[PDB]
Design a protein around this ligand. Sequence first.
Ligand SMILES: O=C(O)c1ccccn1
Ligand SMILES: O=C(O)c1ccccn1
Ligand SMILES: [Ca+2]
Ligand SMILES: [V+3]
Length: 223
Amino acid sequence: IVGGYTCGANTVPYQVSLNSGYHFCGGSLINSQWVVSAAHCYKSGIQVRLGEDNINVVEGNEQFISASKSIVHPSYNSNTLNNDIMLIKLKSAASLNSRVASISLPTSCASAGTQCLISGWGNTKSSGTSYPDVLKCLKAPILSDSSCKSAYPGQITSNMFCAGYLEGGKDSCQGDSGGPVVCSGKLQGIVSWGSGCAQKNKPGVYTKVCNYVSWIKQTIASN
Ligand SMILES: O=C(O)c1ccccn1
Ligand SMILES: O=C(O)c1ccccn1
Ligand SMILES: [Ca+2]
Ligand SMILES: [V+3]
């Protein structure tokens, strides 16, 4: 997250870190057994880490639980990142508490201009690299679909939206992939892709979770 702030320990209690020997992507806890992340975060051997603030220090509220199964969206396209969503099942249910909590799925899509909270452990530099070990947060509005498509012609589908600031300075970045975009208490986005970080006229692009709620519900009920 570039241009954000230190969230505070466990202030985003649905935020997960996906670990394969190291943090590589975020995700969002949607019930005690299931996490939503980006399909472009798929790999075998995922451990889900819940209750994290500093990802390099055991602070006492963590739960580390191996994934039993991953389900990439059936229409995921790794070239275009269309349908950039995946479900991860925990081998054992998480113990839900104030620091390890689920986020609700949308009942409807969010409007342009709605303010959202984006979070992650990604790079905090727009020019260079520095990784925070504690969770970063960013308040950012959903941008109009027209501003989004203007920035990325022929690359935006109905399954994507842009959020952030066209003037630059504030954005998601490397290591934020898969993490949450929460708006009005609902998981509306997944950190998906962009061009650079926090550059002018190159906002972040996010998977439009509201399009996938039926798929999520049906998939988790059958797995
Ligand atoms: O460089 C990355 O890994 C990146 C950038 C933007 C969004 C997600 N990931
Ligand atoms: O392509 C990306 O954005 C990416 C891939 C792997 C881990 C984090 N991000
Ligand atoms: Ca920790
Ligand atoms: V990434």
